[PDB]
């Protein structure tokens, strides 16, 4: 139905240790793109101070995204994958599980619809 | 109201040789950045075969992203920036400017709430 799949993700109250250090958060990010199916071409984490992670898995044609506030239990994660081989879902799970979110807010965004382009 | 603004863009009918131009979407990605007035942490851009390029600019707890697809003159944005300081739609102008995109659609997110965290 369309090039992509999207899934922009809140997650609230998260095992604040976890969001902040950056070395478990690549483990679990590159963890969840197995998952979901993805090849991953590359993969940048950066750790922000005082708190906090920011990083990103380039994979085939699209992208898997995360940055935490520790500070909040908060974290902003994006899910765009491409191709019906690659479920966004399955990276999502892992994700619940590894950062131990209490509450989530998840919206699916088709990106590229054929009948659009 | 909000840790950041998101905006997931869709671009169509875009000049297709800039598209597949690896170098100039660096080029032009950066520019954007800059424009937002946002600060890069780092900047990843890889181009595909036969058509298609993806990159990211990681910026300060955040990022900007873009996964073209030349032969449908498509391509597919993100820009999520943090702090009042720095506006997405300023990068949005001038990438639609750079890409000459001729028809566009965004959905801005606020990502982390402040009355959700």
Redesign the interface.
């Known amino acids: 139905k369309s090039?992509?799949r999207?899934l922009?993700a809140?997650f609230?109250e998260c095992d604040r240790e976890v969001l902040d250090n950056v070395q478990l958060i690549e483990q679990e990010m590159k963890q969840a793109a197995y998952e979901s199916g993805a090849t991953i071409?590359?993969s940048?984490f950066?750790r922000?101070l005082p708190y906090?992670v920011?990083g990103?898995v380039?994979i085939?044609?699209?992208?898997l995204?995360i940055?935490t506030?520790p500070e909040?239990?908060?974290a902003?994660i994006?899910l765009?994958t491409?191709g019906e081989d690659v479920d966004p879902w399955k990276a999502f799970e892992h994700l619940k599980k590894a950062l131990k979110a209490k509450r989530v807010?998840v919206?699916e965004?088709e990106?590229?619809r054929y009948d659009?382009?």
Do not use: K, M, Q
């Open positions: 090039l992509g999207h922009v809140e609230y071409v590359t940048t950066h922000f906090g920011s990103v380039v085939s044609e699209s992208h995204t940055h506030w909040y239990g908060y902003a994006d765009f491409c807010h919206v965004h990106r590229g659009e382009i």
